[PDB]
Write a protein that binds this ligand. Structure first.
Ligand SMILES: Nc1ccc2c(c1)N(C(=O)C1CC1)CCC2
Ligand SMILES: [Cl-]
Length: 117
């Protein structure tokens, strides 16, 4: 990650861009598994396997609260979503497929955000 991403504090303008990125992910057709925390009814052992769960609604709350100080922190939460999914689910599962599509889309959007800063 470049120096700007690591430590240039997020400005209010940056935050408007982060909101747009997040909304783009939330609107993507393959984002359904990631919109809200994993339901333990859908995976009873999930919270014993995944020590730091993450989901787009938690990220939204954090964005609205101005939790993130640096772009790296936002990227780290987003990456947790995908890493948790690839670790918990087998590589042939629809969940894993959704993570590979959505992460690629996130990278496209993130590059656009970084260029716009
Ligand atoms: N939303 C939803 C529904 C069912 C399941 C998940 C999520 N899981 C996931 O790992 C998805 C988030 C990547 C756990 C296994 C089954
Ligand atoms: Cl939608």
């Amino acid at each position: 990650e470049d120096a700007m991403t690591v430590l240039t504090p997020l400005t209010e303008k940056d935050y408007e861009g982060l909101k747009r990125v997040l909304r783009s992910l939330q609107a993507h057709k393959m984002a359904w598994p990631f919109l809200e925390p994993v339901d333990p009814n859908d995976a009873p052992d999930y919270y014993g396997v995944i020590k730091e769960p993450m989901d787009l609604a938690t990220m939204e709350e954090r964005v609205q609260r101005r939790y993130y100080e640096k772009l790296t922190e936002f990227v780290a939460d987003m990456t947790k979503i995908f890493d948790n999914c690839r670790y918990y689910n087998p590589s042939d599962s629809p969940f894993y497929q959704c993570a590979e599509v959505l992460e690629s889309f996130f990278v496209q959007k993130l590059k656009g955000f970084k260029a716009s800063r």
